[model samples]
Target: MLTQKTKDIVKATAPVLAEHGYDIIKCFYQRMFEAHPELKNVFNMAHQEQGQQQQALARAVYAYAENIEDPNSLMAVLKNIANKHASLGVKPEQYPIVGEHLLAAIKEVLGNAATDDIISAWAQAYGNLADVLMGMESELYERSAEQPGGWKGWRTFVIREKRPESDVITSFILEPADGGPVVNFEPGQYTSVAIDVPALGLQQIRQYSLSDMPNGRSYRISVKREGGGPQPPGYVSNLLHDHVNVGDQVKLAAPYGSFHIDVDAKTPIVLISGGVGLTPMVSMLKVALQAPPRQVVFVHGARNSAVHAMRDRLREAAKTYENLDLFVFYDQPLPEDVQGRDYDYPGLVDVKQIEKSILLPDADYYICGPIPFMRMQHDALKNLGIHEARIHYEVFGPDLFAE
Candidate 1:
């Protein structure tokens, strides 16, 4: 527990921390990584170069310091962060290592301003926060290991089958190398797959949504090949596409996420996606179809037919399944594409344009896409008179949602 005095010091000086938060985190990473080069395998080097990791940490530190007085207010957000750490196979021991480097960085950056009392107070505050985080993460770790067919840390999985879903998207069917029953996971949760990149000479883990219903023996993940240009191409994604073959082993962590459909709800469902965001939607759609038949409206936006993966499967489902409506929005459809045929909506997805067709009453909406796209959809839903409680969204990498 942080002393009332320590909390006051942290709270009073939060503005100072916020002003230099980015630089402090940058220094912290530089020092930490220099000292523990082995940890590079765990972090996303691409995010570091892009400064995303630094910016994220800056926001977190600022938020924590700002809320030091009433710590319970931070618990909800900490829960999400802890879940991510658990999914990354983070251990309790790593917290102390991080704290040491973070406090050192603070002292180094804030030299004259960082008094001995300030440093001591921050140390206590960090320790308390770390304990809370570790406790939350420990519960998640226990759940992962204690669940049926679940294991701790990284477990080896073999690529049972590899199939191309579209020009840019591919699917890999993976099963445990130990030939054990797979853990049953919620429809929209994701699993982190660790792979060794021979080029980088490091192991990297990337989380991909479980794209299909659990078969009790294997899980499926669909990956979209990211072509590198201005941004470095996806190391893990390209490796999976170009090199990983059936029978090759990869490492997997247990499923972890808060975004999921309420299978028990018998109300209407709206599954919205853009491009590769379709991964989790597919899982929810498949599972919902198996559930005691609820109304499902799948709205998808894609560039063209070439990139519209699983168009056939969706059409096939629509042909047989009743109350399952699909509306595809082609931002830039090919010349050969026909209106009201290849797609239903042109340009971006505006729920207002198709408000009549959406059947919005008694519906819960799940949105997965780029952050900007989600913001647009969220506003559109709000404009359509939908309540906030009915809307849910997923963040692909970090839980940097603007609270």
Candidate 2:
């Protein structure tokens, strides 16, 4: 709850903050880290380095300000972040620390522009938003406790097995290191892996979508090794691939994500994935196969057969399910390789090819891949007259809701 004056100030100042949101958030992070360097282990270092976390925080603050009068409208966004907070081990006490720095940054950025009334209004707004987040995160903690084999924050798990999925991708079997049952996760949700790398001299955390169906045995995450560059070998991913051995202890957060196969029985489902983006799509495909009256079409685009991650698993799924179909599009195929397999297409996936392959125009579509691939697929889908609501996607990097 906020005073009417406070609400008015928040509404008025939201646009001002939006205009300079990035700088405010940048300053906020700087001040926060300066005060509490240990918090870095809890935040997404990769996203923070890329400035995606700052952008997301800015967008969220703007959204909260805009919806101050009707705060419930921001519930969906709040829930999304609350889930992340739970995974990142964000505790209730940390909210005040964040709010304090947030206000300090606001004051620093606004300078003399921040009058007593404006500061008070922003404080009230921050309190209100913090209340929402705290409540949501508290509920998440409660749920995690009630759920079987679940716990709050990052828990220790042991690498039970590691299997190569392709030349580039490897699947890790993770189970509780303390002999506790593994937590059940819904298909399409992802878990955070925390690695203490000697080279990095600090703990690095990364999120990976669970590639296997939740079977109460062990959670599986398939990771692709990205050769070092601007990405810097993906600290956690590289450590998991290179140094981690079977029976080694690792820390993992509980599963958290919104993407899943939950729809009406007759709803048509289309899964489009490229490169390592096939991880979540594979989970959705398995879930879709269990549905009684669903039509699923998995369209995958890769460089070639050698680079495809889970071709055999998908083939077996297609063979086991009657209403499921698999389409592969190879962008650069060797002459001998192209002759070996029966592919539905040979070039990039486009509207015409989609129409030729899919029978239902009204089916729900999920697309995941690199930025350019997603952009092209989204345009192709829109051009094919698919309803905007029927199309959904997930990006491996930031902007999971990118259009």
Candidate 3:
């Protein structure tokens, strides 16, 4: 339990911490990595290199301090993090290691501003947060392990099939190497794939959303090749695209995430996505279209036909399913792309234009895309009189879109 004094101290110094949050987090990662280089295998090195992890950690710490009086207010966010941690196979023992380096970084970054009292308060606060997360994660791991056809930690999976979805995106179908039934997952949940990155001489773990409805036999993940030009290539994605092939084995953690839709709900669902963010949405769409079909509005935005994944499939589904409404936006459609047939809108996704179609009573809105794109759609939904509670979104990488 955190004391009143501890909470007060943490709250008071939160501004200073936020001011230097990026620096503190950068230093924290550096110190922790220097001390325990083996941890690199567990964390997303791509996020680390992109500095998204540092920014996300900084924001999370600041938010925690701000909500010290009522941590439950952040329960939703914490649950998301806990689910991600569980998917990554994070252990209870690693919390102390993170706390040790985090505090050191805070002290080093703040210099004389970080007093003994402040440091003590932060340490207690961190421990408290760690306990909460560890408890939540423990329950997640336990539930997953107890499920039929489920196992804890990493399970060996073979790439049974590899097929290209678009110019850049490819789909890999994985089956348990043990030839046993795989655990069923919620539509929007993701499975972590761990493989050794020979270039870095260490293992890397990347979570890919289940792109198809749960089969209890195989899992499909659609991965986009994430780099070209000046941007550094995504290590795991590029490797999976180029090096990894059918019949190759990879380690997979149980599918876990809090961003899934209610499978039993009869209400309408609006799935809005951009680029490869459509992976989880596709899964949700498939489930929604099952027996006793429910109303589903799938709104997607992409560059053009060349980059759109499952374009033909989506078109066919839109034509076949009366309960399904498809809206595609191609911001940069090619000359061959037709305006009314290939895509609905010429520019970015503007929900306001199709306001009547998506404004169903008690509709749940799920948005998945880049942070900016999610924010744009979220704000648009709010402006359209949609309740905040009805809006749910998923961040692909770090939980940087906290607000």
Candidate 4:
């Protein structure tokens, strides 16, 4: 519980938080990392280098400070954070370390402008927030660990099969080294893979969606080789692509995620995806197709024929199941690509074009893609009269939806 004084003081510095929060968070991260270098494996340092980490922290602080009086209203956003933290295996002890450095940074950056009352107030505020988060995450960790075949922290997995799915994407079939039954997780959940990056001389962790339905035996995760043309190469993604082989072993955390199919719902499903975002969609598709089937629309957007992955798998399913409707959108189709044979549409996914096929009164929409693409599809769905509750999405990195 926060004292009234704490709320008011945080309210006072709320303006400062929006204006200079990035610098404060940047300072805090630098100081904290210098003191605890081991945490680098736990965080996305690429985002740190790009200043997105600081920016996101600043935005979160600004939102919390602005809504201090009714921070409970931010529960959904906080829950998303907690879920991501659970994936990274963040511990309660680490919260105090982060809070300490954050407070110091707030004091250091604000200088004389930050009064003693304000400092104490912010400390209490952070503690209060951490208490809620830690409790929530504690529940998540326990629930995951208690689930059948579930375990906490990193589990050893050997790559059973390594195969290319597309020009840029590859799939790794993983089986537990312990030779036990793999946990049954809800579709769309992701597992964190911790690997040693010899090039960087530091271990790195990256989250990849479980790309296939859980069979209580093995899991599949697909990786896109990042940084091909203009984008910078992904440290961990590229490592998995170039270095890891069929016999290689990698550390994996139990599945953790907020976005998942409502297994109980008998409603139709619209799985809209772009590029590598199809990983989770495939999982959802497999699970959905397994039961008494309902209508399922798989809308996939890709650059062209060469980059499109899992075409044969989806095509095969479409032929086998009358309930499955496959729609492929090629934003930039190659010269060799045929119209109706290779892809259905030559432009971006305009759901309006397939409204008759996908839009059902009782249908649920699950979208995964770039932030902008997800936003586009979300706004489009809203325009088409779909309720927000009927739509589910997952972010690849920092959840911009937390805003």
Candidate 5:
């Protein structure tokens, strides 16, 4: 519970915080990491270097303060964060550590502007938020642990098989070292993989969506080599690609994610993805094609045939499943790429182009891609009269997509 005074103070300071949110967050991370170097193992340092985490935390703080009176409005985002925390094996004790540094950053950044009343109010608010998240995270951990073949914390998984899916993507089939059945997961859930990064001499953890439907024996994750464009090479992804091999053991957390289909729903589903974002959609597509099938439309965008993952597999599935419709968009098709065979469209994904095929009654739309790509599809869906509730998306990183 928050006092009216606290709520008023938080709401009043939200705009100011937003103005300097980035700097404050940068300061906060520096302070937190300085005090607790061990936390680097838990957080994605790539995101830190890219400044995405700072921006995300800044936006989250402003949003939280702005909605101090009615935090339930942010329940969806909160749930997503809680799921991520649980997957990362975050503990409640870390909340105070984070909160302490956050307050110090606010004080240092704002100087005398951060008065005693404002500080006290924000401290209370942070405690309230932490309590809510900790409660939700604990419940998630408990529910996962209670499931058959499920265990809390990290489990040893051996790479049973490794196969290249595309020029930049590879699939690894992981089975528990204990030779026990793995817990079943929702079609679009992800598991956290923790491995030592020799370059940094620290363990890095990353979440990869389960690329294959759960079989209660093993899990599959399709990881992309992330060194293209302006960004530096991804430490964890590159390590998994070049160094890790079959029979190599990696620590894996139980599958957990909020971005997944409601398997019980009979409504039509449209999964739109770009680049390597097709991983989760593939799982959903396979499951949806099972008994008591429902109409499914899978829209994907990529550079060309050379980099498109599971191209042959997707084509085969489309040919075999009458209930499935696939639309592939090749933004940069090569000269050898055929129009009718290699790809359906030679441009970025434009849902409007397939308006008639996707405009089904009570259809649910799921989009996964870069932030800009997801925004484009989301806006297109809105333009086509789709309700916000019908649109769900998954952000691969710090969840700035919601902002």
Candidate 6:
């Protein structure tokens, strides 16, 4: 309940915060971590390194301040972040801590720029914002708790089975370590895995999408081993691949994400995935194929045939489902020894290829990939005049909607 004077003050100082948004958020993180070092396990390390989350939070605050009179306009953005926060195990009690540090950081960063009036106004506005988030997140937490086999924070699960899907992709079967029935998850939702790696000497949590259908038996996650220079072999992913064995226990958060298949059979579906981003798209495709849909196109982009994942399963599914279409684009060419193989399409997935191969112009497009690749696809889709609301994407590190 912000007074008119407080609202006016917040509106007046909105631009100032926007101007130094990054600096304020940076200071906020510094102060927060200094006061609470244990929260490092909950935050994304890569996003912190790139400052993406900081920028996102700053932009969000500024936007909310500007629309203090009409905060409903920010519901879409809040929902997106709230879902991510739920998956990260954020709770209502944490909002006050965050708001306190945020106000302190604003004063520290603004210094002379922040007068008593402005600081007090911002405090009221922040309280209002925190109340909104707390309410929304409370609903989410209640829903999670009510769901079968759901619990707060990370819960222990045992690796029931493990199998190789391709040269790079491997799948793990997980169930409750306590021997409880596994909770069902939406096809494209992801779960966070928390690991206490001895090598890293710290706990690391990574999100991986469910790769198979939620058949009440166990949850399956397919991970592609990303090996390269300075990448450090993806601590959690490598551990799952090399060290984690059948019956080994692991901590996992509940499934949550925005990417999902259209349950309505009348609408067309286009799933575009690049590199390891195929994980979620594959799940959607499997669900789509199981229940016959009118039109479904799966466009997967890979480096080469050697690294392509789940080609056989896709081929088998396509064989039975008449409406299913599989289009593979290889960025690199195969050697002579690997030539003449089935289900191989060589080239990059650019605008020309997409326009030529895709039949339905009004279909929903779900894309997930590296940042550059996603940007390219988004621009291409926009250039082709696809409806803005029809374009759905998932980001790996942090929310990039902020400038």
- Compared with the true structure, what per-residue lDDT tens digits does model 5 show for residues 15-70? 77777777887898899999999998998777746367657766776777766667
lDDT of 2 at 327: 86
Instruction: For each candidate, give its TM-score against the true structure.
Output: 0.93, 0.88, 0.97, 0.95, 0.97, 0.87
lDDT of all the models against the reference?
0.85, 0.78, 0.91, 0.86, 0.90, 0.77
Residue-level lDDT tens digits of model 6 in 194-227? 8887775667788888888777767888888766
Residues 1-403, candidate 3: write the lDDT tens digits.
Answer: 9889889998888778877877887798899999999998997776646377657766876787777777668787889889999999999999989999989999999999989999998889888889989999999999999997899999999999999999999999999999999898999999999999998899999999999999899999999998889887889999999999999999999999999999989899999999999999999999999867699999999999999999999999999999999999998999999999888898888899899999999999999998889999999999999999899998888874637
Better of 4 and 6 by TM-score: 4
RMSD (Å) per prediction: 2.1, 2.8, 1.3, 1.8, 1.4, 3.0
User: After superposing candidate 2, which stretches have Cα over 4 Å from the reference?
Assistant: 3-8, 46-50, 61-72, 229-231, 263-266, 291-293, 339-342, 359-362, 383-385, 399-403
Q: Which ten residues in a row have the lowest lDDT in candidate 1?
A: 48-57
lDDT of 5: 0.90
Per-residue lDDT tens digits for candidate 2, residues 138-178, read: 98888877888888877888988999888788999988878
Better of 3 and 6 by TM-score: 3
Off by over 4 Å in 3: 48-50, 400-402
Clashes of each: 0, 0, 0, 0, 0, 0
* Regions of model 4 farther than 4 Å from truth: 48-50, 66-72
Candidate 6 regions exceeding 4 Å error are 1-26, 46-50, 54-72, 231-233, 336-345
* Residue 281 of model 2, lDDT score: 84
Model 3 residue 241 CA deviation (Å) reads 0.4
Model 3: per-residue Cα lDDT at residue 365: 97
Query: What ranking emerges by lDDT with the best candidate at the front?
Result: 3, 5, 4, 1, 2, 6
lDDT of 5 at 290: 84
